[PDB]
Structures are given as structure tokens and as C-alpha cells.
Subunit: 397 residues, 3 copies
């Protein structure tokens, strides 16, 4: 059971739940219905457990990528907003919340990687990657460096690789093509090669992770870094006079960073579908709804569309939205588990000298068609595990 | 060495073989060629073992589903009956004996699930599933159950789940689509939802297996049950006044049971292809042939139109055919094995409460895909080893 | 790290590397560029190990089939010959060197099976396969046989299986179809029936391999054998008066044996790509280039038209070329590994009577799919999980060692 009447909501700890409950109070003054906002620990792991048994929250707030696997299990119900409501949110944020063609959640907040620069050492950030080598030699002569960001992660290095033409899976007609992997193409090729060049030319260090790079920017040792909204707090406390802006273009093409849309999904087994429907649409996805959640903990950029235009006064946020629009939306499929492991090695192999661009990229393509496609076969290890649970609980109890 | 100049036929022991031999005796008089009718134990296991080597019978009689794997291993030869003789049989039976878009056997007899009811407790059977909630409460007043059938098996529950639009695999233009599974669509969902509700409204028991149901019906405790023609014999002994009829409809759609067509196939190694074709086309699949087999032991509903309109005079046989023309033919492909296991769990989990209708059905489609490609793994490791196991050890943290 | 300003060519020791070196030092006097021709052991397995790390030769010479796996790993750079140069070579040789719809190597030599016969025992060799029954019992009267070739290996028996319609995969519009197999079709069926009928009519023996076949023709016991140009050296030794010709036809259709094209690709990591394209186009792939390679160790049938029409004076070489033009180019895809193993059992099980024609070829079409995919799986993880654990062991020494 999931209690017919009260709307129980599950949101992550680090989000503005008090600002959400503040909205949940204005709901119960209107149609009377009591709202309980719980923030359970490891809820992205508890939800797939209790929801399967027909329990859990009415509404779940989490990053869209994880909703795919939920929608695969039939844990989420198809939402029903009209063409009128669908337009007061950003067109692209609707592609983030679709599975098999059905819409399975409402978009809330967008999050993308942005260029972060020290105004003191560089009052005018570079619009092209091409000029970064030349810029470094200008700064090295003064002891500083041009750019420092996490090279160990594909999430950070992908924007450059993807820039010219690289992509995870082809998204066309509101659906994902798992037999169309663009990690090997001419765009990803020249992309990685350029990164590899900036490494052997001695402009970036192959061993740089997240800690080394953030510390360097928060020390004033580097003029630029690539990072998202989460880092902004630390950069305040170090008191570095910094600005956030659009990502540098490569070959005359904008960098395409991955998009992280926070979304609200309705439980399939919830009996209060028309109440959640009323909750999220009429109230939360208006200025007054979001403004309440924002004041508790900032959401960054938002899907509505009236309200972000108001927030867009802060350049930092307007820079997140602008990067989010030019980027590709992080695919919500189980084959995305693969792509990550394929590219993480490909970027690390190529950057160290172990393999070449051509080689390490073409190797990754085979490794994707290995991982998540065989890991798919290891799903039957749980199907055939039920034989274990059956052979004990049908025989006896 | 099948001795070029004779026909040796394999048919199961329970089946009316003495009748087949009579038609083999008739065949002999006319052509001068001796026909043998043999019934070895587990012939459906022995056949592919000897047919492979180029040994065994010229004609093997068995349920069409098993012919899927035979056709695969090329043990069966393509039949070439002209269009004239095709219209002699029912259209939907020709879809049962078709592999890779090719005809690989002759249809003989149709077996399908039906609604069997106690004429005394219920002189008029419901024509809708939706009515069974009401009908139970009326009979629970006289100390009787309305409906009791095997709920442990998908074979029995499927007629209700498929009724709204669910399907095993998609069949169009003589071909099955192994990527088009209709287990989790809109139809199957509301189907299982109804079957689940009848349980949580206490109209049925989640624990009811085959035995319980047949015992509950045979002693006169329950009014109705779902079962095939194999069960009639026992009900006679129990002297309960029963009748067989078409399954109840759900949302104005007929129930879709599985159809097991008994068929005769010609061996690919057989040197007497033309004599077999002469025997099955001109002597067995006629009024005079099938009547003789049926006179030994009943075939039930037959694929031949002229003789079916004669057996249908018994209400029970006409009901099985009625239910058949409304059912989906059981797929003879190997992916069918996966379908069973996935659905068997799905129904059991939904019927116990473990998982919801929406989740259990979606998860069965991930099971049907995973278990099906994992069967290739077992079969590759098996047939690679016979050319000269788990391989498990998959290994992260990366969150901080 | 491949050494800029100079060339380094790899070719197998068995081939005319000294002939190639002559063309090497020809290119020197004319452009002032040092061309080193090395011939190292198991180079066909060493190349993907050094080219992966961005090292090795500039040009590699090997049979095209192995390039598919090289092109997969991206080790070979796309070649750009214009349509003017392309027409110098036979059209079919361009299909042997194509991956993902891209040309990745320059075709040098062509290799195929041919019908070899004894002109003493049999002056006029049979045109069709169907007349080999009638011919066998004639020679059996003298105390000889008509034909004996290696039945153990599909590479040998395939010309007959494929003759009526069978194919490995469907090559159309510059790419192969891994889901279109022609192993159990009505052509392959009748093909293999005929081979088996010859076995159970006692015209051939099911236990015959390469050694049996070669030694039996080399001692004049059999009138015919099917073998390629590599065998010729041994038949020149045996002093047997022998002829090479086009393969017999089956049901009016010519036998389609497999084609092996020796070809030269350019390394992806090579900095001298326009020099490699200079040496291979203007110097080597001309008759004066191939005249020198051929003089060292004969290449057999050459891809270049002009020089081919000169070598065809040898009736043996002329026949080898004809059988290639009738043949299908051996698919360079990784699924090919399976095809062999599937068809290897099919032919052996069909010859031994352990299975019928129909039954044996139908297992091959299932085995080929079952192996290739589920073997291609395993190989991915072996070469991933063994390099995943190798990763943390470095980290253990970056702080300890
Ligand atoms: Ca509205
Ligand atoms: Ca400056
Ligand atoms: Ca406001
Ligand atoms: Ca886009
Ligand atoms: Ca008569
Ligand atoms: Ca009544
Ligand atoms: Ca009569
Ligand atoms: Ca030219
Ligand atoms: Ca000359
Ligand atoms: Zn909490
Ligand atoms: Zn530089
Ligand atoms: Zn009720
Ligand atoms: Zn050597
Ligand atoms: Zn003969």
C-alpha cells in the first residue's frame, strides 16, 4: 500500500526538501491534501525495491538517467501534460524524461559542465580550444597555467571529444539506437587527438584528477578549470574572484557536455496519480513553487521557462543553461554503463601513451558491445537465482 | 537403410495406433507396399538422435511445437500439397506447421483448452469473465465455488492474460517475430489485473494447482473449471453431469488458449517421400482414414473439414474447435522455452502479491530476452565441448 | 617513433623481400629516402602489438584476410588512390582490401586453388564434376584413381559446396552481411550431396588429408588433385608431367574457390603516409617493380593488369588467375573464424555418414552464429578483465616500488 490521500515524496538529502515541504503546505490549504516530504538514505536503491512490491513514495525526485531502469521495470506511470503545459518548459528537457516513447517524469532542474575562470589572471576567457596552447605559454612565463581539469573522468573530457561529432548512442525520433555508437567516428578522433596533443606538448598533466585540479584553481595556480554547479561553494570560500561561462569551441563547433536533468516521477502503483498530477503541474512548476525550493538549496538552472529567465540575472546560472542547451542529454539506458567503462579506458590509454587515438578509440567500440551487452546476460543470473528462492519456498517455508 | 520400398511410421503409444495400422493395411492392398506402425518409448527424444544419422521412420506423428526443433536440424522434409488439398483443411492449422515460411508437416488433430461446467450447479455457463465475481458470491451461498483451475501454469492462465491483446510472439505472413514480444503491453496488463483481483477478492486461491481443481470439480464442489480433452475421461468416471463450452470473454474479446496441433511429418532421409505423400494425402487424411484412427482412440477435433463437421455433433468436440479458431497457435520456435519460464514467474509473483501487475509483467520480458540468449551460451558451450561451467567472476566504487 | 624521413617495410621471410629491397634502393636514388625491409618472425601477430603502441613499420605485407582485424583496431590508415590508378588493377582485388566501405590496403598478389592433373594418365581434363564418376571407374581399371584432394579441410572442399549457390556471407555494396549466411541453402545442399555420393560410391576416401593427397599425385597414383600454387615446387621435384587448369563445373556453374590477396597497408601511426603512397603507387605497383619481386620469389597471379598479361604466358599462372576471378574473396571479418569451424564439422560429419547432407549443414548455420558471437563475447572480457586488474598493480608500485 501507498496510502490513498497523503502524498509522500522522496527527494535526495542534498536538495532543498524544506523548500519543497513549504510548497506541500500551500497545496493542503487549497485542496486540503496532506503532504509528507521524506529524504531517505540511498533512496535510489530503496525505491526499486519497495516500488516493485507496490510500496514506496508517490513522487520520486532524482536524476533522469536512473529513471530509465525504473521505467524498464514499469515502476513509473506515463505522465499526462498537455501541449500547453509542455511548452512552458524547455523543449530539450522533455527528451530527458522519455522512455520507449512515453513521457515518464516532469523536468525540474538542468545541470551541465561550465567553463570556470579566474577574472584576475584572465579577464577575457578563450572562445576556442585551439588557442589554449598559445595561452599557456603566456601564463607559464608568469608561473601560472592555462587550464586544469579532471582527465581521469570521461564525464569531463567528453565535451571536447564529442565537440566535433562524437556521441554515445544516436537519439532520433524520441528513441535511442543501441547499434549506433559514435565513439570511433572522425569527430571523436580529432577531438581526442587534440587533448592528447595538449598533454604531450606539456600544457596539461595526464595524472590530473578532480582534487589536484580544483585545488589548483582554488589556489590561484591556474586561470581556468572545467566543472559544474556543485563546485561553486568551495570556490566561494577560497575567495577567488571567478566567473562562469560557455565552453570553448573546437573546430568551430561548441563543446557538448552531458546534461543532468533533475526530475519528478510518479509511482505506477500509487493510487494518487491525479493528486501528484495536480501537485507538480499547477503549483511546483510555476515561479512560486520553484522559488520556494530554490531559496532553501539552489537548483541551478530550471526547466521552466519564465523562472530561469529571472534567475538568468546571475551569469553563473545563465552559463549553466547555455552549456546545457548546446550539449547532449545523458542517455537513460543500461548500455550507458558500458559506454562509460569503454571511454574511461580509451581516454586514459591514449593520454598515457599506452595506445594511440585510432587504436584506443576503436578498442572502446568493441568494449561497449562487450560490457553492457554481456552484463545484460548477467541479468539472467538473477532470473535463474529465483530458481534458488523457488526451490526453497515452494518445497517448504 | 530404410529399405526403399516400404513405410515405417512412428506414433505415440497413447494415440490411436491400431487404427493407423488399419489404414496402413488398406494402403498395402492398393499399392503392394507394407506399412509398419511402431510406438517406441520417448519417440520425440529418439527421433532426432537417429534421424540425424539418416535412420528411423518415414513418418513421425507428434505435437507441432516439437517440430520446430526438428525442422531446424533439417530432419524434416518440405511437404508439397497442392492448393486444392489445402482448402480441405482449416486455414489456421496450416499456420501451425510452417517453419521459415515453409510447410513441414500435415495437420491431423487440434487440442485446446475449454470451459467445462457442472450442468447441475449451473445450467447456463457465463459468457464473460467479468460476471464470475457475481456468480461466485451466489454459489458461495450454497457452499460451492464458481471457478477453479490450474493457476500454477501459464498454459492455463494465458487464455485470460492474452484475451485483451497479449501475445507470445508476433505472427504475420507465416513468420514469427522474435523481437516482437507482447507480454507487457496494454492487453496482457489489464488481463492479469483481473486474474489478480479475483484472488484478492477471495474468489480463487493463489495455491490452486491442477490436482486440486480436478478433484474439486470431480466431487461436485465447484461449478466450472478450465481444462482440455485429456481430462474428460476422469469426469465420466466421477458421474458428474458436465458440459464443455467456449471460454468466457473478457472486455468483449474472446479468450485465447494455446493450440496443440497433432501432425505428421516426412523424414528428410526418407527414400519414399512420394509414397509417404501418397499415404498421408490420399489415405489417412480422408473421411475413411481418420474415422479408423478415431475409432481406436479419439483424436478429438480434427484438421479435416468434412470429418470435423461430423464429430462436432458431440457438443464437447465442437467446443474444442470453437475455442481453437479463437486461440493463438503455440509457437514452435526455441525462444518459446524462455516465454514459459518468464511468464510462469510473472503470474506466480503477481498472484502472491510479491510484485505488482505492471512490474512483474515488464520484468518477464527482460527474463525472456536474457534466458533466451543465455540458452545459446549453454548450447555453444555444449556443442563446442563436443567439438574437442559458469565463467563467472565479474568485478567498482567510483562514487566519491 | 616510427622514424620520420625514412621507410620501414615488413613482409614475411618466405616472400621476395630481396626483390622488394631492389625496388627499395630504386626509390632511394630517385627521392633520397632510405627504405628498410625487415622480415621478423610471427610478424603478423607482432604488428598489432607495436602498432597499438604507435610503433612498428610504415608498410605491412600480409594476406588481406588478417587486415580485417587490423582495420578493426584502426591500425591501418585509409589509402587514397584516385580512379586513374584504381583501373590499373583487377576490379575484384579492390574488394579484398575494403573495410567499413573504405580501402585500407594496396592489392599485390592473388592466390587461389586450381585443378591440377596428370597429362600422362589424363591428357584431356574433365570440364564438369559430373563426369568424374564415369572417369574414375575407367582409371580404376588400370589401377589408378581419377581425383583425390584434401577432404578434411573446408578450404579445399568449398569450391564444390559454393558452386551451386552457397556463400559464407553476403558481400553487397562494399560490405558483408553477418546475418546473411549461405551454408544451408539449396545450392550448398546439392553441392555437398555430390561430394558425399562420390564418397559412398567409393570414388574418393573420407579419411584423405593433404599428405595423402599430395604424395598420391606426386607418385602418379591419382590423375587429379585440387591444390594451390604453393604445391608446385613439390611437383617439380617429383618429376611428374603435370598441368594446372580451371576447376570443373558443377550443374553448369563454375566452382567458386576462396581468394587470398597479398596486400600492403599503411600504418595509422606512420608520419610518412604520402611517402608510403609514393612508393606503393609509382614504384612497386608497376611492372618494373613487380618484375623484381617476382624474380626473387614468384608471386603467382598479380593484381596489376599490365604485368598479369605478361605472366599469363605460364599456363599454370593463367589458370590460377581464372579460378580467382570465378572465386569469392575470403571474408576478412572476425565472424569468419566461426564459419570455418562450423563448416569443418559439417563436411566431416557429412563424409563419415554420422549425419546426412540436410542435417549437417543446418547445424553449421546455428554453430557459426553460436560460436562467433559468444566467442567474440568471451574474448572482449579476457582482454578487458585481465587489463583491468593489471591497472591497480601499477598504482601499487607508484607508491611502493
Ligand atoms: Ca493545462
Ligand atoms: Ca594576456
Ligand atoms: Ca518572484
Ligand atoms: Ca543536439
Ligand atoms: Ca483397395
Ligand atoms: Ca441461478
Ligand atoms: Ca464411410
Ligand atoms: Ca594517377
Ligand atoms: Ca622488363
Ligand atoms: Zn536523509
Ligand atoms: Zn605547444
Ligand atoms: Zn468482488
Ligand atoms: Zn626473417
Ligand atoms: Zn559410380
Amino acid at each position: 500500500k501507498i496510502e490513498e490521500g497523503k502524498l509522500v515524496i522522496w527527494i535526495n538529502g542534498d536538495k532543498g526538501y524544506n523548500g519543497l515541504a513549504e510548497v506541500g503546505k500551500k497545496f493542503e490549504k487549497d485542496t486540503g491534501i496532506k503532504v509528507t516530504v521524506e529524504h531517505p538514505d540511498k533512496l535510489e536503491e530503496k525505491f526499486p525495491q519497495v516500488a516493485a512490491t507496490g510500496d514506496g513514495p508517490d513522487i520520486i525526485f532524482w536524476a533522469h538517467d536512473r529513471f530509465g531502469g525504473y521505467a524498464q521495470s514499469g515502476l513509473l506511470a506515463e505522465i499526462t501534460p498537455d501541449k500547453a503545459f509542455q511548452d512552458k518548459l524547455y523543449p530539450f528537457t522533455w527528451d530527458a524524461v522519455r522512455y520507449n516513447g512515453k513521457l515518464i517524469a516532469y523536468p525540474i532542474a538542468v545541470e551541465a559542465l561550465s567553463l570556470i575562470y579566474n577574472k584576475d589572471l584572465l579577464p577575457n576567457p578563450p572562445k576556442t580550444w585551439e588557442e589554449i596552447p598559445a595561452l599557456d605559454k603566456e601564463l607559464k612565463a608568469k608561473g601560472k597555467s592555462a587550464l586544469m581539469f579532471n582527465l581521469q573522468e570521461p564525464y569531463f573530457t567528453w565535451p571536447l571529444i564529442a565537440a566535433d561529432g562524437g556521441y554515445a548512442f544516436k537519439y532520433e525520433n524520441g528513441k535511442y539506437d543501441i547499434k549506433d555508437v559514435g565513439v570511433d567516428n572522425a569527430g571523436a578522433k580529432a577531438g581526442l587527438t587534440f587533448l592528447v596533443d595538449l598533454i604531450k606538448n606539456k600544457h596539461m598533466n595526464a595524472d590530473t584528477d578532480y582534487s589536484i585540479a580544483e585545488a589548483a584553481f582554488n589556489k590561484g595556480e591556474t586561470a581556468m578549470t572545467i566543472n559544474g554547479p556543485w563546485a561553486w561553494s568551495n570556490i566561494d570560500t577560497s575567495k577567488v574572484n571567478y566567473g562562469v561561462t560557455v565552453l570553448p569551441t573546437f573546430k568551430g563547433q561548441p563543446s557538448k557536455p552531458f546534461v543532468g536533468v533533475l526530475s519528478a516521477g510518479i509511482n505506477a502503483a500509487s493510487p494518487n496519480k491525479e493528486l501528484a498530477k495536480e501537485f507538480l503541474e499547477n503549483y511546483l512548476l510555476t515561479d512560486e513553487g520553484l522559488e520556494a525550493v530554490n531559496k532553501d538549496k539552489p537548483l541551478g538552472a530550471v526547466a521552466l521557462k519564465s523562472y530561469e529567465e529571472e534567475l538568468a540575472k546571475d551569469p553563473r546560472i545563465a552559463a549553466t543553461m547555455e552549456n546545457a542547451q548546446k550539449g547532449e542529454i545523458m542517455p537513460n539506458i543500461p548500455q550507458m554503463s558500458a559506454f562509460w567503462y569503454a571511454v574511461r579506458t580509451a581516454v586514459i590509454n591514449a593520454a598515457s601513451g599506452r595506445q594511440t587515438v585510432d587504436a584506443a578509440l576503436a578498442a572502446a567500440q568493441t568494449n561497449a558491445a562487450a560490457m553492457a551487452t554481456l552484463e545484460k546476460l548477467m541479468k539472467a543470473f538473477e532470473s535463474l537465482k529465483s530458481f534458488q528462492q523457488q526451490q526453497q519456498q515452494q518445497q517448504q517455508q
